[PDB]
Amino acid sequence: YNAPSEIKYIDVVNTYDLEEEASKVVPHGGFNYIAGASGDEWTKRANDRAWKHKLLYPRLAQDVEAPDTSTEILGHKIKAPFIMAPIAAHGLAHTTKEAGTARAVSEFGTIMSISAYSGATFEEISEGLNGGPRWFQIYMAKDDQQNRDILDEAKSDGATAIILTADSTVSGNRDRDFGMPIVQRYLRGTAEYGASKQKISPRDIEEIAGHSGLPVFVKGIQHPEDADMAIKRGASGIWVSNHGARQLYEAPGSFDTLPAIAERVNKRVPIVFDSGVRRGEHVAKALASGADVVALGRPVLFGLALGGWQGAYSVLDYFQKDLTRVMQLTGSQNVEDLKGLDLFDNPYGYEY
Amino acid sequence: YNAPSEIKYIDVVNTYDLEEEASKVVPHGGFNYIAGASGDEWTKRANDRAWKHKLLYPRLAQDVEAPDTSTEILGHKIKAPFIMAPIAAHGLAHTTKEAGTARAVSEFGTIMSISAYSGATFEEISEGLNGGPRWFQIYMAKDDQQNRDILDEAKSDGATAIILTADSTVSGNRDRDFGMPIVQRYLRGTAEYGASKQKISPRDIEEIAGHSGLPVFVKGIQHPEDADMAIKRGASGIWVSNHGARQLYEAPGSFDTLPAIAERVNKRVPIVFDSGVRRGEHVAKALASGADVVALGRPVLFGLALGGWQGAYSVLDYFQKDLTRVMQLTGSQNVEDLKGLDLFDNPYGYEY
Amino acid sequence: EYNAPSEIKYIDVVNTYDLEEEASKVVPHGGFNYIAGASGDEWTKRANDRAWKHKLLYPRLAQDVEAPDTSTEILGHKIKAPFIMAPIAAHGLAHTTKEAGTARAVSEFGTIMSISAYSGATFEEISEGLNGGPRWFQIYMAKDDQQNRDILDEAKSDGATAIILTADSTVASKQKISPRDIEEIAGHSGLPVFVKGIQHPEDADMAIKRGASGIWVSNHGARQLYEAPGSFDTLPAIAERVNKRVPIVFDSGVRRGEHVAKALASGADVVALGRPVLFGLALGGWQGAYSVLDYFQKDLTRVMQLTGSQNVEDLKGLDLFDNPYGYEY
């Protein structure tokens, strides 16, 4: 497998073009893995088109100061209201794999999420992170010992939250058709994808929350009753996601699901939103709709493919800068102002 | 007429591609007959796009066991909540014609529907069925003797229900432009498509229900008042269908009609739903919307074209497996759970 | 020295609302308030009653020749009309023959008796009144697993054919039940378990997933939560979510044959009757309670004729007129 290895800054004008550019340097199989989604990708398209359902108004300013994109989540101050989503196998995009991603995220000044299915050996990731905050993403194992193992690993690696992914990564079914050091460290000699439950229950959430010693986000929530159940089971955060349309097909665009969840959560726990964030305007819309931060996924990996850590950094830089402009135009001085924006309801949808 | 004759399993990744693949092996005239629909096919397109109007939510599991797709209808246990729709002239797709279809359905473990316009001679069908359950589809003859004849035939052939099709198969009018052993057995020497009424009435339904000695499904229902009238006339089931858009043009997509019918039927009799089922997600949505089972039509015939009974079996296998995955993602352990799913209302339609 | 009525006689029931007032004349004040009252200032009890005006019946042409037949069946038991007796505590507040009187009325009429956890009659006394007729046992969730096991064993040995697990305590018992409780009861009962007090569709789905064999849509006659919807307003959403998985019993506010029809049209298999049967009991013992069941059956027959319905299944198929104006129209 010959992943790109060049490290360089890139002039990111938009994130959509990064996909096609990346397709030129990433081996076809790995590229398809990263870019593809369930079915005929109609729900991935829905993730993207959902942003046109609620539109931004320009508004007069009410404050004199320059815009400030910084925010805090779980008591940690970060440079802008976006974090890195947990994504498996960054080596499919770049030889520096998760270490490169971590470097970009740490240098930028936000939170790195580490997939249990990382191709890098934490020590490798740690060198990219250089002290930066990190959250650990897990799947629910059928074997309770394996959950104990990964929770221990996460605490040892200095994780400050656990991301409990609700859906099993068999991959999800598409119409079209490395090792895993972190888990192999604990599965070795056991002979145990199929090791995890296909879907978690409130009881699973309670088990993980009770034993992690850390706040647990439940990731993959798209229905408000699941958010309420998860919080009652002991979740410390709700991560609204459809995993970039990689799981359930003929489901809504993730952004359409956010307000009903935010209204039901009603401030009880922080909300992370993802699945389809491509522009600064999307970050603003998520915050206006109830998210505390958003997670970024595919665009960062395409950046990684194109320039290693500097290419990934350029993508985070693009989002921060684009968000600043959206703040100016919406009359927003800070991230809290964005949470107060009125959106225009577009009943016409994408074609207008 | 040179229909395909090869028997083989196929790797079914999606059912849409089976159409185009089939177009390569089926003679053009026969292929057009199977694939085509009324007008410019706008209502066939509507059948397909209707599935995007109600979207699936992923939901937390509430039960520990592996998903079980089995269900019961009319007291017969079947492997998954789908049956074979009555389709004329399977010989247009494959030399093993209805016998091949029957073999696939019987081996899979569901119900075979036999079209009155079968190209095979029941004895041929019977050898494929090998004891498997079968329902008999009839049209309402103008001549009452001919109805007596076919009802006798059905009872003799061990049918456990009658499917009374409400609309006469003159074909339906398109913008573009074998024998029938089962009916010829009774029409011989009579000199009698035009032998049947163009449309049935409640009085017809009552006549058939009174004399069949078997539960009668009325097939082609798209309006709730017709469902109520049919039940009052003695129907034992409602089969919601527009016959794969082969009859009335500039009518709604079949799935859009299902909830109003299900609400009016209100549990009185079982509901079979068809017209446009292409994915596991569609089976789930139909059940969530009030159907007890769905019927499969064109995809099975395309499978038949491509691999005889094994090709048709591969299609049923695809639906069963895809449904299992949808059950996992929706937190559903069984077919009853699917009937309880909440769907997301998408007011935007296909383009989102 | 509680002086409950003791006369046994048939009564000419023209409407059930007048039974409350008439009953107030013969039942001791304290007992009467207990029966007739509800939470808060009774706004939710009034909501139970006014909710029937939100969906209105249409007269319709007939499509069959035969006279109306009210018979139905639930859980394989054939009953005379689509209503059963709700579980109500302490019938001795209404009449000296207490639950034995009510049981006699229900069995003579030909429907199912529900026996409250707080019955004032002994089972032997009730058994005599039932004379073999079907009965369901209503229980609360005990905090002690062994007490639950004992109650479930007693019920099945007493010939119960279903258990009604009431989700809310009025009053050893849990105040509110959870899915786990439902599962524990369903797992050990050996009988279909109805979960009673459901008003929200998500609870119906959870209950069924936990092993309930029936959903009993109720707010216990507005006796529990105040400033909640009228029970009938909650029924369609629940019926749509249940989607035929298990039978639905509906109660809380049924007073007319039109209400029985509207409940069936909206997804209930049967309804349960409560206060009106007890007012009948106060007024005439088992014969007075019987007269109330007879009123509902005859009044439903008239409603069937007018709606063009020959049988209980036809009622399940009625279209209702949506009245967005509500009570004052």
Ligand SMILES: Cc1cc2nc3c(=O)[nH]c(=O)nc-3n(C[C@H](O)[C@H](O)[C@H](O)COP(=O)(O)O)c2cc1C
């Ligand atoms: C290549 C790929 C691998 C992923 N692997 C995981 C995974 O290991 N665990 C997880 O919780 N989510 C995983 N995700 C989903 C992401 O965390 C995130 O929800 C998604 O990328 C956001 O959608 P977007 O990238 O289209 O904006 C993966 C996504 C992709 C693109």
Ligand SMILES: Cc1cc2nc3c(=O)[nH]c(=O)nc-3n(C[C@H](O)[C@H](O)[C@H](O)COP(=O)(O)O)c2cc1C
């Ligand atoms: C080639 C063809 C022939 C058909 N012949 C009959 C028929 O004989 N009787 C009948 O009731 N329906 C007939 N149908 C309709 C099917 O029973 C069923 O309603 C339809 O195939 C479902 O639509 P779908 O196949 O697009 O999912 C036919 C459909 C097609 C494709």
Ligand SMILES: Cc1cc2nc3c(=O)[nH]c(=O)nc-3n(C[C@H](O)[C@H](O)[C@H](O)COP(=O)(O)O)c2cc1C
């Ligand atoms: C006096 C009184 C006592 C009741 N006791 C019980 C009880 O023991 N257990 C129970 O599940 N419900 C109990 N209920 C509620 C009834 O089962 C039923 O839900 C209610 O009477 C129906 O409302 P309605 O009578 O106004 O039409 C009681 C209701 C009343 C009026």
